[PDB]
Design an enzyme around this catalytic site. Structure first.
Site, PDB file in Angstrom:
ATOM      1  N   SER A 117      18.842  12.964 -16.822  1.00 54.74           N
ATOM      2  CA  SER A 117      18.607  13.922 -17.904  1.00 54.74           C
ATOM      3  C   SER A 117      17.366  14.803 -17.789  1.00 54.74           C
ATOM      4  N   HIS A 162      14.894  12.090 -23.143  1.00 53.96           N
ATOM      5  CA  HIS A 162      15.222  12.962 -22.017  1.00 53.96           C
ATOM      6  C   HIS A 162      14.195  14.060 -21.911  1.00 53.96           C
ATOM      7  N   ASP A 200      23.407  17.851 -34.646  1.00 54.37           N
ATOM      8  CA  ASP A 200      23.146  17.490 -33.252  1.00 54.37           C
ATOM      9  C   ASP A 200      24.365  16.802 -32.620  1.00 54.37           C
ATOM     10  N   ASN A 201      24.811  15.719 -33.243  1.00 55.87           N
ATOM     11  CA  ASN A 201      25.943  14.954 -32.748  1.00 55.87           C
ATOM     12  C   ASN A 201      27.257  15.722 -32.704  1.00 55.87           C
ATOM     13  N   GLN A 256      12.291  14.077 -36.239  1.00 60.43           N
ATOM     14  CA  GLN A 256      11.520  13.159 -35.405  1.00 60.43           C
ATOM     15  C   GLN A 256      10.025  13.271 -35.664  1.00 60.43           C
ATOM     16  N   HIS A 314      26.015   7.092 -25.312  1.00 57.05           N
ATOM     17  CA  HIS A 314      24.652   6.974 -24.792  1.00 57.05           C
ATOM     18  C   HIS A 314      24.448   6.229 -23.460  1.00 57.05           C
ATOM     19  N   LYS A 333      20.807  15.694 -38.686  1.00 58.98           N
ATOM     20  CA  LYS A 333      20.728  15.193 -37.315  1.00 58.98           C
ATOM     21  C   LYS A 333      22.126  14.820 -36.811  1.00 58.98           C
ATOM     22  N   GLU A 374      16.244   8.043 -32.064  1.00 58.15           N
ATOM     23  CA  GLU A 374      16.967   9.292 -31.943  1.00 58.15           C
ATOM     24  C   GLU A 374      18.482   9.219 -32.053  1.00 58.15           C
ATOM     25  N   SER A 388      11.498   9.716 -19.626  1.00 58.54           N
ATOM     26  CA  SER A 388      12.884  10.088 -19.907  1.00 58.54           C
ATOM     27  C   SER A 388      13.691   8.822 -20.136  1.00 58.54           C
ATOM     28  N   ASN A 411      18.689   9.366 -36.463  1.00 61.48           N
ATOM     29  CA  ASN A 411      20.041   9.819 -36.179  1.00 61.48           C
ATOM     30  C   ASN A 411      20.840  10.061 -37.446  1.00 61.48           C
ATOM     31  N   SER A 418      16.991  18.010 -35.047  1.00 59.46           N
ATOM     32  CA  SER A 418      16.735  16.608 -34.736  1.00 59.46           C
ATOM     33  C   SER A 418      15.261  16.313 -34.465  1.00 59.46           C
ATOM     34  N   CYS A 431      27.275  18.702 -29.233  1.00 63.51           N
ATOM     35  CA  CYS A 431      28.285  18.263 -28.271  1.00 63.51           C
ATOM     36  C   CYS A 431      29.427  19.268 -28.113  1.00 63.51           C
ATOM     37  N   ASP A 449      14.782   6.947 -28.007  1.00 68.42           N
ATOM     38  CA  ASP A 449      16.130   7.503 -27.955  1.00 68.42           C
ATOM     39  C   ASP A 449      16.905   6.570 -27.029  1.00 68.42           C
ATOM     40  N   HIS A 487      21.931  19.527 -25.282  1.00 71.71           N
ATOM     41  CA  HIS A 487      22.216  20.387 -26.440  1.00 71.71           C
ATOM     42  C   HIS A 487      21.337  21.638 -26.382  1.00 71.71           C
TER      43      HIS A 487
HETATM   44  N1  LIG Z   1      24.886  12.807 -25.146  1.00 73.79           N
HETATM   45  C1  LIG Z   1      24.627  13.317 -26.383  1.00 73.79           C
HETATM   46  O1  LIG Z   1      24.210  14.479 -26.548  1.00 73.79           O
HETATM   47  C2  LIG Z   1      24.809  12.551 -27.660  1.00 73.79           C
HETATM   48  C3  LIG Z   1      25.285  11.190 -27.519  1.00 73.79           C
HETATM   49  N2  LIG Z   1      25.496  10.349 -28.631  1.00 73.79           N
HETATM   50  C4  LIG Z   1      25.991   8.984 -28.375  1.00 73.79           C
HETATM   51  O2  LIG Z   1      27.391   8.949 -28.567  1.00 73.79           O
HETATM   52  C5  LIG Z   1      27.782   7.677 -29.065  1.00 73.79           C
HETATM   53  C6  LIG Z   1      28.604   7.848 -30.302  1.00 73.79           C
HETATM   54  O3  LIG Z   1      27.830   8.625 -31.254  1.00 73.79           O
HETATM   55  P1  LIG Z   1      28.447   8.933 -32.696  1.00 73.79           P
HETATM   56  O4  LIG Z   1      29.582   9.896 -32.744  1.00 73.79           O
HETATM   57  O5  LIG Z   1      27.331   9.325 -33.588  1.00 73.79           O
HETATM   58  O6  LIG Z   1      29.066   7.464 -32.925  1.00 73.79           O
HETATM   59  P2  LIG Z   1      30.144   7.037 -34.000  1.00 73.79           P
HETATM   60  O7  LIG Z   1      29.902   5.606 -34.331  1.00 73.79           O
HETATM   61  O8  LIG Z   1      30.129   7.954 -35.178  1.00 73.79           O
HETATM   62  O9  LIG Z   1      31.584   7.200 -33.367  1.00 73.79           O
HETATM   63  C7  LIG Z   1      31.990   6.452 -32.227  1.00 73.79           C
HETATM   64  C8  LIG Z   1      33.392   6.077 -32.620  1.00 73.79           C
HETATM   65  O10 LIG Z   1      34.001   5.270 -31.586  1.00 73.79           O
HETATM   66  C9  LIG Z   1      34.945   4.478 -32.140  1.00 73.79           C
HETATM   67  N3  LIG Z   1      35.196   3.446 -31.155  1.00 73.79           N
HETATM   68  C10 LIG Z   1      34.425   2.346 -30.883  1.00 73.79           C
HETATM   69  N4  LIG Z   1      34.931   1.579 -29.909  1.00 73.79           N
HETATM   70  C11 LIG Z   1      36.089   2.246 -29.552  1.00 73.79           C
HETATM   71  C12 LIG Z   1      37.087   1.959 -28.577  1.00 73.79           C
HETATM   72  N5  LIG Z   1      37.075   0.895 -27.766  1.00 73.79           N
HETATM   73  N6  LIG Z   1      38.135   2.844 -28.465  1.00 73.79           N
HETATM   74  C13 LIG Z   1      38.157   3.937 -29.293  1.00 73.79           C
HETATM   75  N7  LIG Z   1      37.281   4.269 -30.216  1.00 73.79           N
HETATM   76  C14 LIG Z   1      36.270   3.392 -30.304  1.00 73.79           C
HETATM   77  C15 LIG Z   1      34.191   3.974 -33.375  1.00 73.79           C
HETATM   78  O11 LIG Z   1      35.065   3.427 -34.375  1.00 73.79           O
HETATM   79  C16 LIG Z   1      33.494   5.237 -33.891  1.00 73.79           C
HETATM   80  O12 LIG Z   1      34.203   5.965 -34.959  1.00 73.79           O
HETATM   81  C17 LIG Z   1      26.505   6.862 -29.222  1.00 73.79           C
HETATM   82  O13 LIG Z   1      26.341   5.999 -28.074  1.00 73.79           O
HETATM   83  C18 LIG Z   1      25.413   7.919 -29.250  1.00 73.79           C
HETATM   84  O14 LIG Z   1      24.145   7.418 -28.746  1.00 73.79           O
HETATM   85  C19 LIG Z   1      25.221  10.876 -29.948  1.00 73.79           C
HETATM   86  C20 LIG Z   1      24.786  12.106 -30.173  1.00 73.79           C
HETATM   87  C21 LIG Z   1      24.537  13.067 -29.019  1.00 73.79           C
HETATM   88  N1  LIG Z   2      18.076  18.786 -24.439  1.00 73.45           N
HETATM   89  C1  LIG Z   2      17.885  17.614 -25.050  1.00 73.45           C
HETATM   90  N2  LIG Z   2      16.615  17.124 -25.141  1.00 73.45           N
HETATM   91  C2  LIG Z   2      16.397  15.945 -25.756  1.00 73.45           C
HETATM   92  N3  LIG Z   2      17.302  15.121 -26.332  1.00 73.45           N
HETATM   93  C3  LIG Z   2      18.567  15.618 -26.234  1.00 73.45           C
HETATM   94  C4  LIG Z   2      18.961  16.816 -25.631  1.00 73.45           C
HETATM   95  N4  LIG Z   2      20.347  16.984 -25.728  1.00 73.45           N
HETATM   96  C5  LIG Z   2      20.752  15.910 -26.367  1.00 73.45           C
HETATM   97  N5  LIG Z   2      19.724  15.022 -26.712  1.00 73.45           N
HETATM   98  C6  LIG Z   2      19.854  13.730 -27.428  1.00 73.45           C
HETATM   99  O1  LIG Z   2      20.480  12.750 -26.649  1.00 73.45           O
HETATM  100  C7  LIG Z   2      20.538  11.619 -27.562  1.00 73.45           C
HETATM  101  C8  LIG Z   2      21.354  10.456 -26.985  1.00 73.45           C
HETATM  102  O2  LIG Z   2      20.576  10.048 -25.868  1.00 73.45           O
HETATM  103  C9  LIG Z   2      20.705  12.287 -28.837  1.00 73.45           C
HETATM  104  O3  LIG Z   2      20.722  11.593 -29.961  1.00 73.45           O
HETATM  105  C10 LIG Z   2      20.690  13.760 -28.710  1.00 73.45           C
HETATM  106  O4  LIG Z   2      20.020  14.225 -29.893  1.00 73.45           O
END
Ligand SMILES: NC(=O)C1=CN([C@@H]2O[C@H](COP(=O)(O)OP(=O)(O)OC[C@H]3O[C@@H](n4cnc5c(N)ncnc54)[C@H](O)[C@@H]3O)[C@@H](O)[C@H]2O)C=CC1
Ligand SMILES: Nc1ncnc2c1ncn2[C@@H]1O[C@H](CO)C(=O)[C@H]1O
Ligand SMILES: NC(=O)C1=CN([C@@H]2O[C@H](COP(=O)(O)OP(=O)(O)OC[C@H]3O[C@@H](n4cnc5c(N)ncnc54)[C@H](O)[C@@H]3O)[C@@H](O)[C@H]2O)C=CC1
Ligand SMILES: NC(=O)C1=CN([C@@H]2O[C@H](COP(=O)(O)OP(=O)(O)OC[C@H]3O[C@@H](n4cnc5c(N)ncnc54)[C@H](O)[C@@H]3O)[C@@H](O)[C@H]2O)C=CC1
Ligand SMILES: NC(=O)C1=CN([C@@H]2O[C@H](COP(=O)(O)OP(=O)(O)OC[C@H]3O[C@@H](n4cnc5c(N)ncnc54)[C@H](O)[C@@H]3O)[C@@H](O)[C@H]2O)C=CC1
Ligand SMILES: Nc1ncnc2c1ncn2[C@@H]1O[C@H](CO)C(=O)[C@H]1O
Ligand SMILES: Nc1ncnc2c1ncn2[C@@H]1O[C@H](CO)C(=O)[C@H]1O
Ligand SMILES: Nc1ncnc2c1ncn2[C@@H]1O[C@H](CO)C(=O)[C@H]1O
Lengths: 430, 430, 430, 430
Positions: free
Chosen positions: D81, D53, D188-189, D363, D299, D184, D154, D76, D179, D359, D193, D129, D351
């Site tokens: 994003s 992103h 981050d996670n 990287q 994601h 991380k 990532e 990106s 990750n 994170s 969030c 990522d 974030h």
């Molecule tokens: N937008 C953002 O800033 C961030 C996004 N992510 C994304 O979030 C997602 C999850 O990340 P994590 O917490 O690290 O994953 P994680 O694997 O630790 O947790 C996801 C959980 O979902 C549960 N799960 C799976 N299928 C399910 C269903 N049908 N119903 C209910 N629960 C279910 C799993 O058992 C697991 O404990 C990934 O796709 C990752 O790329 C991760 C970090 C930051």
């Molecule tokens: N501002 C940001 N810039 C870059 N990556 C980010 C940002 N916020 C969240 N992310 C990342 O988004 C991914 C999932 O796409 C991650 O693993 C986070 O670390």
């Protein structure tokens, strides 16, 4: 003829005294009232009868009242709230105490009756908690109303009855609503319960709070504090209320609000904090999950219909003092705490010292207002002066290392308040 | 001659309208006031002049007032609080709106002046927030005081000035303290800020809250809400206060209470919630860690001495609208938000709809009381009927799926309250 | 010749039994192990020697092990952790138990020695908590190492020593790190302490938590749990750590992190959770506020230098069992809990049943792995199968009314995991 | 022929630059990697292609990579994003950037393709990522796999696919699981969030969190962080999971765990954090309360069946960019955020800096490991050295004024760890 005092085991004195001393260090306000009015003895000539749980925290109160020149005779306002080592310390101190843990309803009365007549004659002052004392006299011994200069009420239920007695012209003596004191309701009712409720549940059941569903009836200060306690341990808290505002409050905090009728089916720990009857009925006991823990923290013992359990359970087995496990007909078991009586004081040691110090400071202030400024207190029910109230809080800041700020002449001007004087209006709710 | 309305870009109408519509679904009380008094038009004949942040939330207020028969002319009580799409919606709706985001202090006045004379003549009602409107007239156009039937005050600072004007016999028209309404102070001031403060800080700085040290001046409802917010994200909150009670409160919550003189050395985010001047001075800026973020959520912009910064910093660079980074002489940088102005409304969108609904409902109720029951409101400053108050709370319980409980004749008796009627005394502080 | 068992008062059996039965209802995992392996008796032929706090929770473990065909001889791994009614219940049940509350260090050893030889000969399995049993033999009775098939370690300190013995080639028998089991460390260590720490502090001191400053040394699972507990009551928590990550964690949670050297001056309650020596020294005791409460929850008693106190205080007065108040030379008093020993177990009843069930289920699973699949466990220190681990959690979901979701063939595909099978990698930390 | 770079409005550079500079001050680790490897230029000769992103936080990463001698071409990994001012700053900086906010799925691909060929030839390093880049090449341009020395992943979804490719022997180049780095995943996670989710919901909807019911699918680090955020604002959080442990966790925290099938009837805000498909279906949308807000933070965009809504709603009206209000057939409306896409990055700014610094540091470390120590990384997927991991945390302690403690030779001995060296085993989960 009459007894000098009545307690469980006066040999508990030594230990009580140590407890009292340790506690004195935790009650700044109480000790401040001592260091300030011990010589002037403002309560000189006073013969106070008090009905409050005879605890270590209460001994420090009684001793502070005696330090201020008062003459005291005490009794507990609960058959299980007494702390026998604190009571044997007050008796040995030479103060007439008639209280012990586990008195039959019949002894509970005889104990109050002892505190009605002093050497120099009957009482002239009432320090109550619950309302039992000010009612025993108003209805049983009305001939004493004339010799009583004032009343001090500790709890919500007690103060509610005062407003009532007055409403029907039954109140023949002045009283001060001590409970409604901001430093009383917002600290004793709220923070005290947040700590002392679970102490009661735990010591008795040793149950794990995390993961359980806890139902709290009523969202007053006691409710808010009980809810935050449970909820902060990992429990899921459901709240039942009859008030729109209080309810919108529980909702704006993430709590689910519904009826006991629906909730009784989900909860594992039931805590009544409302001050009214029939909160938990047989119709509910029949839906509770097995081994549900039911307790009440409101002031009296009719929130939970114990009689029903008593008259409908296959069998009742007492685990240990103030802990009964009932076997319903559906087979589930119901663990009842303190026979529907106050759980924090019945199964635990009540609120912690520091918080009781705020309440008891307001209690001493009150006695001094009623017994020294009778004019300002005509028959009815009054609040303690805002100034006196803000004084309790102020007297506890040092122990907590709290550093207040000071306005500058410039600021004090800006606002229009006194750089060193009060600025809070009486609409302030805190 | 006179302008019909003045806004930024009326082409923002379509978007604003959608915004309004989405919001209306979030403000139950406001819509309930519409569905109940639209035909009776209780505000018929009324010509209201309001000084409140022209937001989406306010548009739903204005429209509700027009729905009830009122004639309205609006202006924002902040040069940065306006939400241009909501203002271009009210203008298109045909309502005279003179407000935009980023007016010069000089335009800020002209805008209020526009809302002083209607078609049928001058105003006869005042809806204020902050005190600028009721003061502009009391001191600049006293000839209009005669034609105004009442005043509605939104915020603390405004209500504090009313109580002042009255104290010095300056208040020539009645006013209703809307702020002090339980459903306003305990929901808007506390919960609104718990959510909308950070929305302001984040959108502007995008700073990470966790791990930082946040200093909040004042522990009023706004302070408690801001503290719990920051503290809930992982920030360490230090609180400064001049009140014993409020301070003992911050303390009993785990917050460290001390002076700004000592705290300015540790904090990373400074938030003034107090309603008085000189809360953060140059003597402090010189001790703040690099890139400290300073913002104010109190009503006016003198809590933080911005002039000092302006007259003592090596250089000022504007990052983006309402965000300035200053270079002190010691090298550190100070990120100032909204030029000392309201941070939630200047850098964010203000309180969320649902909470504003409580406040604005009280606001509509007030106008109806003043304009319809003038007798009950003699010159001075009054509270809104406890009944009307508890009506706002009650009108929002459904949207939250809150299920109130109901007393039984037996209970209603026990307490002495009306099974269906009120039971809360006015001492209740909530 | 040898004694059959040794306990305080076997007349405490009746009460203990009720306690055991109430607890059984709270330990799903343990009971589920009983309902599945009672007939097969997988532990048949086993002669287990265990060193674990003889509590009610531990009796349900012991009985479960006997249900599975094992022969057990028990002893407490603490001189104050024993629960005399639970020990007199195991003795009566006919199981040889040598444990009581308050043994002299000398009796503490004799007790363990009793559990070394069974009817059919010496032990062949070790169930340890702390490391004392697997070390008494490795160093005092090495001739028995040959007859022992495996080791089960309950706590961090115990497991740290295993990895050590192995490092220096001292470990002569296989061991399973039960502590590092996710359902053990993240539930027992974190949640158990969050509830059982304060139970110990309160029951002993009855101190008010709100408003105090609590210093917690070490931010491990135990630290995180103790910090959240205290902090959740209104206390201000300061944390000291030696690890960057753990420290960044405390910081990202609003906790202030610094050295004990600086913190000893501010705190009122001191809790050591680190598993290393000299966390609190005399150099500190001399700076603590009057009546500071000092306790340790780590496994052994050298975190707090009690010897110093013992050899430098003007006088030491015992308030009640496991509670001492010391008079320093500067006049301040220091309330020490359980002589630096485990506070939750020394002054309270330890972790609650439900959480102990998770840990003890892992403990039974382990014995079955070691005693039945010796092949998979060569001399060294191993983890319990992730499958068996996830089995403990799974076996407690029902009691909590937890409703797991189910992937559809389509989803199970998307991810690539088994719709009904495992999907969590071993990098997962939880 | 080829474009030098592609962005929205390069005139946004100036503003972006200030943004980058303000952010640099918040990213200690990134700036520390610069101050240490700028001269040695360890990434000299490297031609990195990254799919991340394009944010302000990412510009500081890209610049840090260029500072270390690398050559970079960016894109990106999300169509919404991108932060146009941060991208126009990297372009002006002279770095080829092909990214803007709101690209059609078709442009999203062209953008990645641009970053495949540098001046000196094709890429030799991948910073990914999500997994799109390492897959675009593995399946569309396999001829380049030979010239790529390593991969940096990532996020969880990306790392889950790597482990998959490897499982089916599809991975032709080495990769480092960034990750799973404790600093991380646990920062981050979880913490990122906890702050950035609501930023996304609020900015788009401006909804009030307090009082609402929030359903979060999945209790991973992301789930725990989102739950604590919503729950911390006064919302009631329900959780759905497929894992026993994670679920028992949510339960032990007070969260109600059930199926989406039952929960879709109660919630007001729905947030998918699971990394799998079909979490929210039309069978659910048909039961949601009016104007329910649905968003996904996982994601990719298939957790919410957006096609259904798109193919089953009576009408769809776009409120503002990335915000759509649908009208179902039953009359209720469903507010969808970012078309099922990442909410924190699509509707907010992702974030906060400080957390992203952890994170991104990992990287940069990873790129240096892969490009300089190819030997230690054979084809497969590896973790980053625990030492390197603990170095990220350590490099952020100073900004937070964290004061680590230091063992004494005596202590270092006691434990057996290095007074100055590491002591944490790899079983540690944190
Ligand atoms: N937008 C953002 O800033 C961030 C996004 N992510 C994304 O979030 C997602 C999850 O990340 P994590 O917490 O690290 O994953 P994680 O694997 O630790 O947790 C996801 C959980 O979902 C549960 N799960 C799976 N299928 C399910 C269903 N049908 N119903 C209910 N629960 C279910 C799993 O058992 C697991 O404990 C990934 O796709 C990752 O790329 C991760 C970090 C930051
Ligand atoms: N501002 C940001 N810039 C870059 N990556 C980010 C940002 N916020 C969240 N992310 C990342 O988004 C991914 C999932 O796409 C991650 O693993 C986070 O670390
Ligand atoms: N054991 C202790 O330490 C303490 C006990 N108390 C007692 O607790 C009681 C409550 O005290 P406060 O919180 O100050 O009272 P409160 O009046 O503030 O709150 C009780 C709440 O219960 C609600 N309620 C009443 N009937 C109900 C019903 N049937 N179902 C649901 N909700 C119902 C009321 O609307 C009210 O908001 C009093 O009896 C008081 O004496 C108070 C302080 C300390
Ligand atoms: N932007 C917004 O959304 C809102 C803004 N406000 C404004 O915020 C201000 C405060 O509102 P409330 O919490 O209702 O006021 P409040 O009066 O309850 O609390 C302010 C507190 O500051 C303390 N204080 C005063 N001077 C101080 C000083 N120099 N240092 C430290 N503490 C000091 C006072 O004792 C008081 O407790 C008012 O100006 C009000 O108009 C109120 C509600 C919402
Ligand atoms: N009484 C009880 O119920 C329980 C006791 N324990 C015991 O508690 C202890 C710790 O257990 P865990 O949290 O699992 O250990 P842990 O290893 O996760 O955490 C202890 C922390 O202390 C830190 N530390 C070490 N020396 C320090 C020092 N001098 N100053 C500050 N911090 C320091 C370490 O870096 C580590 O992060 C062990 O001895 C264990 O046996 C564990 C579980 C339950
Ligand atoms: N330890 C204690 N000693 C005396 N009164 C107490 C104690 N704990 C709680 N209370 C009071 O109990 C009443 C209700 O009976 C209150 O109003 C509390 O302030
Ligand atoms: N979005 C909003 N629209 C109108 N008034 C608001 C908004 N957010 C906060 N306020 C009010 O701002 C004042 C102080 O100026 C209050 O008393 C709040 O109720
Ligand atoms: N009631 C209890 N019975 C047995 N072990 C316990 C109890 N409470 C805590 N523990 C254990 O105490 C050790 C440390 O001795 C642990 O690892 C905890 O699981």
């Amino acid at each position: 003829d009459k007894l000098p005092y009545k307690v469980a085991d006066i040999g508990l004195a030594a230990w009580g005294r140590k407890a009292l001393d340790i506690a004195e260090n935790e009650m700044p306000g109480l000790m401040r009232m001592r260091e300030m009015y011990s010589a002037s003895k403002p309560l000189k000539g006073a013969r106070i009868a008090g009905c409050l749980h005879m605890t270590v925290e209460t001994a420090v109160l009684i001793e502070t009242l005696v330090a201020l020149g008062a003459e005291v005779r005490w009794s507990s306002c609960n058959i299980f709230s007494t702390q026998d080592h604190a009571a044997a310390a007050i008796a040995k101190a030479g103060i007439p105490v008639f209280a012990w843990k586990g008195e039959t309803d019949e002894e509970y009365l005889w104990c109050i009756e002892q505190t009605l007549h002093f050497k120099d004659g009957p009482l002239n002052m009432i320090l109550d908690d619950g309302g039992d004392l000010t009612n025993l006299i108003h209805t049983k011994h009305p001939q004493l109303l004339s010799g009583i200069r004032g009343i001090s009420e500790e709890t919500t239920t007690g103060v509610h009855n005062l407003y009532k007695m007055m409403a029907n012209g039954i109140l023949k003596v002045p009283a001060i609503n001590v409970n409604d004191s901001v430093t009383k309701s917002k600290f004793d009712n709220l923070y005290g319960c947040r700590e002392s409720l679970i102490d009661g549940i735990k010591r008795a059941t040793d149950v794990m709070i995390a993961g359980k569903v806890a139902v709290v009836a009523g969202y007053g200060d006691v409710g808010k504090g009980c809810a935050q306690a449970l909820r902060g341990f990992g429990a899921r808290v459901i709240i039942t209320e009859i008030e729109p505002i209080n309810a919108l409050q529980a909702a704006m905090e993430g709590y689910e609000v519904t009826t006991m009728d629906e909730a009784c089916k989900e909860g594992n720990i039931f805590v009544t904090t409302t001050g009214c009857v029939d909160i938990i009925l047989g119709r509910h006991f029949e839906q509770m999950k097995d081994d549900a823990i039911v307790c009440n923290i409101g002031h009296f013992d009719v929130e939970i219909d114990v009689k029903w359990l008593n008259e409908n359970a296959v069998e009742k087995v007492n685990i240990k003092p103030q802990v009964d496990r009932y076997l319903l007909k559906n087979g589930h078991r119901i663990i009842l705490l303190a026979e529907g009586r106050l759980v924090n004081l019945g199964c635990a040691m009540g609120h912690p010292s520091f918080v009781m110090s705020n309440s008891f400071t307001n209690q001493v202030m009150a006695q001094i207002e009623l017994w020294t400024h009778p004019d300002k207190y005509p028959v009815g029910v009054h609040f303690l002066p805002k100034k006196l109230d803000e004084a309790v809080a102020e007297a506890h800041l040092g122990k907590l290392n709290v550093k207040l700020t000071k306005l500058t002449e410039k600021q004090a001007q800006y606002l229009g308040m006194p750089i060193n004087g009060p600025f809070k209006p009486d609409h302030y709710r805190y």
